Amino acid sequence: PHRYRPGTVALREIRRYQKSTELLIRKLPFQRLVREIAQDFKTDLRFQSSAVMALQEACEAYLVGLFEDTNLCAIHAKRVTIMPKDIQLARRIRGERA
Amino acid sequence: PHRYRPGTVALREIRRYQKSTELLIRKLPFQRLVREIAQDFKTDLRFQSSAVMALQEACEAYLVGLFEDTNLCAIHAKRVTIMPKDIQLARRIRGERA
Amino acid sequence: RSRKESYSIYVYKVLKQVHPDTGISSKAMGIMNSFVNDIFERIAGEASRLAHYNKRSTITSREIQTAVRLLLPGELAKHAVSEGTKAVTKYTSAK
Amino acid sequence: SRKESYSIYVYKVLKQVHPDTGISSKAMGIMNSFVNDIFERIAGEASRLAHYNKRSTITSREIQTAVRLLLPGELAKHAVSEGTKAVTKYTSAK
Amino acid sequence: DNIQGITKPAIRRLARRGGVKRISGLIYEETRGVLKVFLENVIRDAVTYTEHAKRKTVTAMDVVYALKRQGRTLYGFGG
Amino acid sequence: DNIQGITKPAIRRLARRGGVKRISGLIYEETRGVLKVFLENVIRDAVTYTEHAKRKTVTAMDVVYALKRQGRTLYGFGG
Amino acid sequence: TRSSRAGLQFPVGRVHRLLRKGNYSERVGAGAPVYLAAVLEYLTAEILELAGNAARDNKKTRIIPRHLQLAIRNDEELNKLLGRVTIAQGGVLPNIQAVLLPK
DNA sequence: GTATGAAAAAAAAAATCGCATCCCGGTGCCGAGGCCGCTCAATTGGTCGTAGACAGCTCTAGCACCGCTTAAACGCACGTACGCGCTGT
């Protein structure tokens, strides 16, 4: 067969997804998740199909936004793989925990 | 003769300064610096003796605040010495630069 | 002289209600003072928006509450929501 | 009901800058939000500027000072101008 | 248990967009956990806006107002 | 050139208080540069408050209002 | 209109109304709404100007969100302004940190 | 522990080969542009009241002087761990 070396793909995958703006999480699973968490605070709740997307948007862009910083952490450690402790470090400095 | 091993002091120095609240920059040099920067935006400016301190406070607490994060960066790199690239990384993630 | 108001006197009464046999420094007092004004302004602000969002011109005890829920962490808000509600109910009945 | 917008003003300005270029509902809505924010940021800083100095009247002066603080250097300068220009031109047009 | 509905590869994507080449198998769970925290914190407020309005339905606006409050403001849904 | 008036050891201290054990000789300059940036950004506004008030003296309050604006709020000078 | 007296597009009126009904102060100095309306117009433009250039560089007539993002983020100044700001279907500026690249 | 050969295997360069992205048509259809009818909000012009402009008096509170002792800064240099680079599951 013919097989590209580990990473080379990812690298392509990045170029692709960087370039596009589409939402990368599957709409329903998310929509459902949103509702599952909704119930915790009040029951018999409805959501504007726009509100759903609205959330999804900020989440992805945030998660992306984190991973950006996350990677910069992993890099600073002479690494290339991101590890929980990278996110943790980022979130700390960000001020999302202590 | 008698010498404490490199670090052991620093370690003490920390315990000490952590514990105290006094301002660690010398008042005049700072006061003067404040004025030197004041001139850049307008000349023949006077400062409330309180305003001066007020600044000094936020600066130190900020610089301390940075160094806290800074060190956490150096640490994450399995290191113990802080290097500019630590601050730089911190400030990036913080959002003080890009 | 000017007439720069404060909260400094109220702080004292509250201090004595909680720790009668404990004093306080000018510097710490001034701090407490600033603390109040901030939260005040934070709440007022969130409330002013709460009003402006819902096409209302009247900020009521209800608006304050909702603001508090948003601004304060869980346990802190709860204990406050209470000590609020308690202070409202008690005044509307005391005429 | 009547959901207001700025969408119509955007268009006129678009054509003044790039006559032969359009815009999407989604981007328009964005631009819309952008305006309201800065508006509110400025208004806010101005409201405080007033309240700090024991005034009840926000003037063209207050707006400016706000802008200086809120906008970065070069952006503020170009704006301070297009402001001042818009004031002067109205006080002379009666 | 819809948290898992956030699929390993769906995260892969997000991280890819961040500029990530390689990803510990631990991350995926970590990420989920974070996302939960985020939404929760947000929605809580978002709802709490709704609760004030006397609506049992949550609007986009409620979402925004909350996102704005949480210092992650969003353009493209009005306000 | 008062920036140097911020003495090598005076920084040492601040960093020590942060919980710093060891410090590259490069840091000291780096730190100065940062401090400048900070004060500048702040004072700029702080002054600009003063400039508005028609005062040639800068008040503590002007300082605070600026610190508040710059998201590094300060208690103890009467905000 | 007042809008024409300044020579602006933006509705100096609707601003003035928005300000009195806004709870921003008691009284609003008829000058203010002008100054502001302009500022907004300018910012609006400065962006559109840039967005329009990105659109052309994509071979599109119509500006989409992505343009706005790309435009804003590449200008140092606009960026700083919209720091704690998210843009719908914005994507991200193609940047991959060199040490990731191969060989 | 130095100059020949030599040599053997990781590192520099081509030719298979293939697989994946861009460009150019070329297919459909939606949601962007401009007409329409309808309300409100923008405009105009009077009425009033009060914010802010102006000039002035009162006294605080920054700028500046001094000359002393003192702890902080400055430096130098001697030696330890601390970081930096290599190597192998």
Author numbering:
A (entry chain A), B (entry chain E): 38 to 135
C (entry chain D): 31 to 125
D (entry chain H): 32 to 125
E (entry chain B), F (entry chain F): 24 to 102
G (entry chain G): 16 to 118
Provide the authors' original text about this structure.
Eukaryotic DNA is packaged by basic proteins into chromatin, which consists of repeating nucleosome units composed of a core element of ~146 base pairs (bp) wrapped around an octamer of four different core histone proteins in 123 left-handed turns. The chains assume open configurations, in which the DNA path zigzags to form two nucleosome columns on either side of the fibre axis, permitting dense packing of nucleosomes by virtue of the staircase-like fibre profiles that foster a key in lock style of interdigitation.
We obtained nucleosome fibre crystals with two different dinucleosome constructs of 349 and 355 bp that differ with respect to the lengths of the linker DNA. Fibres of the 355 construct are highly extended, having an average rise of 42.5 Å per nucleosome, with the dinucleosome repeats situated perpendicular to the fibre axis and stacked edgewise one on top of the other to create a pseudo-twofold symmetric double-sided staircase. On the other hand, the bp insertions of 355 coincide with double helix twist extensions, relative to the 349 fibre, of 54° (shared) and 88° (paired) between the respectively linked nucleosome core regions. In fact, the 355 fibre structure is remarkably similar to the 2-start zigzag form of 30 nm structure.
